[PDB]
Structure formats: C-alpha cells, structure tokens
C-alpha cells in the first residue's frame, strides 16, 4: 500500500547525453507521500536529488528519511555508484541530494557501464519515519 515504510524505485533517463534540463520521475508513495527522483546537469556533473511532497499546499507535514541514491551499472552491480542521505523533509527543504553526484564525463563514458543506448538508470531506496511505529 501507499502506507509502506520503505521502497526502492528506479527512473531511467533516455537520450541522457542530450539532457539539457531538469527532469522528474513519476511519484513513488511511501508513508502516503509522493517521492520523486530529480536529475539535471550542473555546472559538468550530474545532479541527483530525492524530492518529497513538493506539490503540497500545506506546511504541516514532514518525513524523516534515510535513503540511498544510486546510479546503476548494468555490467556489474557491484560497480553501481551509491551515496547515502539522511534528512527531515519538510516544506522549506522538500528535496535533498547531490549537485555533484558524479562527473558528467564519468557517467556518459560508454566504457564505464553507467550508460547504455544513451540511457542512465537512477535508483532510490528510501525509508521514511522508522523512528515512529507501534508501541509493541
């Protein structure tokens, strides 16, 4: 259900080499809030952020999350590149991630295993509000 406490979801960006703007993945619900992967070029590195409830018109929400942002390596998963984040998402800071997740030249290098048919796959494993739960 949308009330699950954790989830893993991927977002593939096609024609990556041509990417000239910021793109958003469709939503993945965790603890009933919409989480999305945000990717964009940064001045060259790949910007990779996790967004939560960005379209809410209320300031009365929060999500204490721990997540792993990863760019998958089709050839050898052991070679996929990951970075962890920990953040209390709320209206003033509803996305969190790395403006310099990886060098653009390193991710687009066809001999590195992060791009196939000009496609790069981003993945996020997110756990929300695990500090909250039933008393027993």
Numbering used by the authors: 63 to 105, 113 to 205
Passage from the reporting paper:
Herpesvirus-associated ubiquitin-specific protease (HAUSP, also known as USP7), a deubiquitylating enzyme of the ubiquitin-specific processing protease family, specifically deubiquitylates both p53 and MDM2, hence playing an important yet enigmatic role in the p53–MDM2 pathway. Here we demonstrate that both p53 and MDM2 specifically recognize the N-terminal tumor necrosis factor–receptor associated factor (TRAF)–like domain of HAUSP in a mutually exclusive manner. The crystal structures of the HAUSP TRAF-like domain in complex with p53 and MDM2 peptides, determined at 2.3-Å and 1.7-Å resolutions, respectively, reveal that the MDM2 peptide recognizes the same surface groove in HAUSP as that recognized by p53 but mediates more extensive interactions. Structure-based sequence alignment of the three HAUSP-binding peptides revealed a conserved four-residue binding motif with the consensus sequence of (Ø/E)-G-(Ø/G)-S, where Ø denotes a non-polar residue.
After many unsuccessful trials, we once again succeeded by engineering a chimeric protein with the MDM2 peptide (residues 223–232) fused to the C-terminus of the HAUSP TRAF-like domain (residues 53–197). We crystallized this chimeric protein and solved its structure at 1.7-Å resolution. Five residues in the MDM2 peptide, Asp225-Ala226-Gly227-Val228-Ser229, make extensive polar and non-polar interactions with the surface-binding residues from all four strands, particularly strand β7. The side chain of Ala226 in MDM2 packs against a hydrophobic pocket formed by the backbone Cα atom of Gly166 and the side chains of Phe167, Trp165, and Ile154 in HAUSP. The main-chain groups of Gly227 in MDM2 make two hydrogen bonds to Gly166 in HAUSP, whereas the backbone Cα atom of Gly227 is within van der Waals–contact distance of the hydrophobic side chain of Trp165 in HAUSP. At the C-terminal end of the MDM2 peptide, Ser229 in MDM2 makes a total of three hydrogen bonds to surface residues in HAUSP. Compared to p53, the more extensive interactions between MDM2 and HAUSP provide a mechanistic explanation to our biochemical observation that MDM2 out-competed excess p53 for binding to HAUSP.
